[PDB]
Design a binder for this molecule. Structure first.
Ligand code: APR
Ligand code: APR
Lengths: 182, 179
């Protein structure tokens, strides 16, 4: 697929807001011509599917101003300082929900916005959980809930799990639970 | 309860393609925070199912991530048109197909932390193969993929595009009679 590649002729950071950083590149496309590409520079993230002994999964409810709504999500956060994402996932599970896990399994890496961000999210399965306490960050508001996976899958079908990272977790979990993928 | 209340709004950036909104909001702690996110018109993605049971997919380079992706065809809403019109036009332009049977599946939000983007996913059936009509700076190859192969590619980490991976899973439930 080499003949679809675009070659970067220049890059600059075009904007830095309070949170978002934008890179503007000029690229040479397969027609030999020059096009502008803009995208967000993102450190990456981790998300985890925390499977409780009773077979429910620990999830959160969190308001997302970008969309003006509350979402049901699996816990997640940004990579800090180029850390291994396993450390991200561990830290975020403890902070957002109060849990630790003895068994961590990497499932897959996803890209949520290939059109305009370099973000990748590493998705983990966390098992053999024990509870401590929630440690929420400044400006983070999050209610923790337990969800039966069968109810989750029905929520997906019904359009109530629109958060792509979480919906994808749900489908991988479904695969794991029916024993098709391990 | 969890809702944040908008106190002020500003469009802080508009480049060649991206537009960023910056809001001051009041959160449940009563405190003021900044929220910044891309303003995106919305998009449609199309799962085009062929009489032979394969699906039409595309390879496209994505500079944000610096590699070529396997994707279902997709594009952005033009002028707040109905996303089914977006879907019909992009399927024609990206792949050269038209479909006489369209079904909305679901709406996904690919980046709830920093974009208002939504993508509406559709199933397209009863197809006729015309020719592509690509936009400028748009370079795309069309491939047929067997859904069983597509699911193995998902397992292997080779369909990392969230919208397409989600399409694959919905196709799987449909094809298995589950949904
Ligand atoms: N980040 C970008 N920077 C510069 N130009 C872009 C970018 N993304 C797209 N373009 C250009 O703008 C046009 C609009 O593209 P569409 O087909 O409407 O949308 P596409 O880029 O396919 O994305 C639609 C959807 O797919 C998703 O994975 C993507 O994140 C978006 O949600 C194209 O001709 C393309 O060359
Ligand atoms: N658009 C935004 N504007 C301002 N502040 C933000 C924004 N998004 C997040 N924050 C805040 O900055 C901190 C960064 O949190 P993250 O570790 O990014 O947690 P989250 O926002 O969940 O991001 C993890 C991931 O989840 C995805 O769905 C999301 O799009 C991102 O990839 C949090 O305290 C959060 O409240």
């Amino acid at each position: 697929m080499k003949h679809l590649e675009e070659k970067t002729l220049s890059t600059r950071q075009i904007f830095k807001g309070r949170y978002l950083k934008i890179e503007q590149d000029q690229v040479q496309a397969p027609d030999g011509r020059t096009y502008t590409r803009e995208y967000i520079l993102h450190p990456g993230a981790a998300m985890m599917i925390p499977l409780l002994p009773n077979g429910n999964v620990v999830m959160i409810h969190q308001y997302r101003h970008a969309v003006k709504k509350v979402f049901l999500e699996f816990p997640a956060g940004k990579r800090d300082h180029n850390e291994e994402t396993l450390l991200t996932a561990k830290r975020e599970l403890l902070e957002e929900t109060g849990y630790e896990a003895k068994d961590w399994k990497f499932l897959t890496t996803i890209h949520p916005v290939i059109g305009y961000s370099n973000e990748h999210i590493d998705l983990y399965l966390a098992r053999d959980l024990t509870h401590l306490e929630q440690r929420l960050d400044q400006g983070q508001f999050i209610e923790v809930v337990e969800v039966k996976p069968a109810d989750l899958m029905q929520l997906v079908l019904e359009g109530k799990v629109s958060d792509v990272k979480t919906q994808i977790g749900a489908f991988w979990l479904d695969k794991f639970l029916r024993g098709e993928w391990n």
